Structures are given as C-alpha cells and as structure tokens.
Design a binder for this molecule. Structure first.
Ligand SMILES: *[C@@H]1O[C@H](CO)[C@@H](O)[C@H](O)[C@H]1NC(C)=O
Length: 321
C-alpha cells in the first residue's frame, strides 16, 4: 500500500506496489517507494506532484521511464533511482530538475551515461553517484559537463575500459571523489585530470599488480580500499603519493596488507594522519621491524590501532632486536 503522514511524507511500506500509486496530489512532499515491484514510470504518474522534494525508487525493477515523467518536479531536491534496471539514461529526465542536490543512479545496467550530457544544468547538485559493478565501461568528456562544484562524486567504474582525457577536468572542485575501478591501466589518466580539483580521493577495488609510476596537486587525503597490493606495487604507488606535496592524510586500512617495504613512509614529511588498521600484519620480527619502529617514532600519526595477524597485538607493541 502507501501511507502518507499529515506532512505529505509518503512511504510504500510493504513491498507490493506494481506501479506508482494513482491519484498522487500537490500535497505530496516526499515519496519513498524503495523495495517494491515498479517496472515502468509514465508521464502521468507524477504530473501533479509539483511540491515533491524527494523521490526514492531504490531497488525496484524499473526498466522504462517515459520522457516527461519528471516534468512537474521542479521542487525535487533528492532523486534516487539506484539499483533498478535502467539500461540507458535520458537527458530529458533531468531537464526539469534544476533544484536537484542529490542524484543517485548507481546500480543500473547501463554501459555509458549516453550520447547527451545529462547534468549540464544541475548547478545546485552536491552529490552524484553513477556507475555499476559489471556493465559500465566508458567515461566520456560530455559526461559531467556543467558540473563545477561537488561535495561528493561516486563513480563505480569497476569494469572501466575507456576514459576520454579531460572528462573529469571540467569540474573545478570536488570535495570527495570515490572511484571503483578493477584495472589500473587508466588510473594515471584519471589522476592527472583530478589532481588539482579533488580534496579527498578514494580508490576502491583496484588490482595494482604491475602498476608503475614514472602539477601542483591539491589532494589532502588519499584513501585506498579493497585494493590488491604487494611490497613492489606499494613502492610504485608511494612514488605517486610522494609527489603530492600537501598530502596530510593517508588511509590504507582494509587492503589486506601483510607488510610494507623498509622506509616506505620516509618521504611523507607533511603527513599528519595515517590509517593502517584492518590489515593482517605479519608481525614476524625481521619483517615487521621498520613498521613497528616507524609507528613509535611517529607516535601521533596513526589513527586507530593496526593489529598483528594471529595474536591481535598492536603492531606498535612489537619490538625487534
Ligand atoms: C542502449 O542504447 C544503445 C544506443 O541506442 C543501444 O545500442 C542499446 O541496445 C541500448 N541498451 C539496451 C539494450 O537497452
């Protein structure tokens, strides 16, 4: 069914709706129909909701949205179409939504964002999430056109195969950029386009085997999550990090790290904080000597407490002769 409170906040509580409820009026201020069985949105469904501020359609089976389905939604600020079955995106959907501050299109099976810029006029957008884990393979220069200031941009480009240079270059500022990408071949391509516009960069799922590194970066924090790394690739990645003059925070937690090359952190003189926890550190002595000693010398940098595999003792508590 669909229950609305006195304030116009409506929710599709039970998962049984086969389509958007009929008869919605100008009184509806929020519509959350997540986890239902909607598969199609027609032009008339939301035609009277001129005061709708949030539309959440997460996890439905939507595969078709008629061209002008959102025409009357000029008051819309939050739109979530995440995890549906949209194989292609239409710029006409976003044309009437200039007030948007949050847009989530994550989890839909589209290969690219389309042949037409989708966000050219979303001048108030703060959070944008696009991509998917298995089908998204290309990023084009026309994507993101129009976007100048963003608080958070999340791109799941797990299967990214192509990246048109300067695609991300047009955005003047992005506070937090999260990039999911399995391969590293396009990493430096993307890096040069965002080094001067991103404050916090987060790289997820990347296989860094065989990665090699050979300006005025403004990145202040770099986070790695679920990346595949080794002493050799960590050294190459550090060559890149060593070049970021103002790098203040480095998050290396959750990357299945077992060790680090001796002296790996010696050139990060401007670093203020480092995260090394949630990693199965091999605290056998010869191997862990550098890291244990480094944590004690730079006693104020570690955030959280890195622990040893097996014993679970703090890495900094290990002393090798
Ligand atoms: C998406 O649009 C492209 C270009 O028209 C088309 O080739 C593709 O089949 C569409 N995806 C599907 C199957 O919905």
């Amino acid at each position: 069914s669909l229950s609305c409170d006195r304030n116009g906040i409506c929710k599709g509580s039970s998962g049984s709706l086969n389509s958007i409820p009929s008869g919605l009026t100008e009184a509806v201020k929020s519509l959350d129909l997540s986890n239902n069985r909607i598969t199609y949105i027609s032009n008339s469904d939301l035609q009277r909701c001129v005061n709708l501020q949030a539309l959440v359609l997460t996890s439905n089976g939507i595969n078709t949205i008629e061209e002008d389905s959102f025409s009357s939604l000029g008051s819309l600020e939050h739109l979530d179409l995440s995890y549906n079955y949209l194989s292609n995106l239409s710029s006409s959907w976003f044309k009437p939504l200039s007030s948007l501050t949050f847009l989530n299109l994550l989890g839909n099976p589209y290969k690219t964002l389309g042949e037409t810029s989708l966000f050219s006029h979303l001048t108030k957008l703060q959070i944008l999430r696009v991509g998917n884990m298995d089908t998204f393979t290309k990023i084009q220069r026309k994507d993101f056109a129009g976007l100048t200031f963003l608080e958070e941009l999340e791109i799941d480009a797990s299967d990214l195969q192509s990246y048109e240079p300067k695609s991300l270059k047009s955005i003047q500022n992005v506070s937090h950029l999260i990039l999911h990408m399995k391969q590293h071949i396009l990493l430096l391509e993307i890096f040069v386009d965002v080094t001067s516009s991103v404050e916090c960069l987060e790289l997820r799922d990347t296989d860094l085997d065989t990665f090699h590194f050979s300006t005025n970066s403004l990145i202040k924090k770099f986070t790695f999550r679920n990346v595949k790394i080794t002493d050799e690739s960590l050294f190459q990645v550090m060559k890149l990090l060593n070049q970021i003059s103002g790098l203040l925070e480095l998050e290396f937690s959750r990357n299945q790290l077992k060790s680090v090359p001796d002296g790996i952190f010696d050139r990060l003189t401007s670093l203020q904080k480092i995260w090394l926890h949630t990693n199965p550190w091999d605290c056998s002595c010869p191997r862990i000597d550098y890291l244990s000693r480094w944590l004690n010398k730079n006693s104020q940098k570690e955030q959280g407490s890195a622990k040893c595999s097996g014993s679970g003792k703090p890495v900094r508590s290990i002393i090798c002769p």
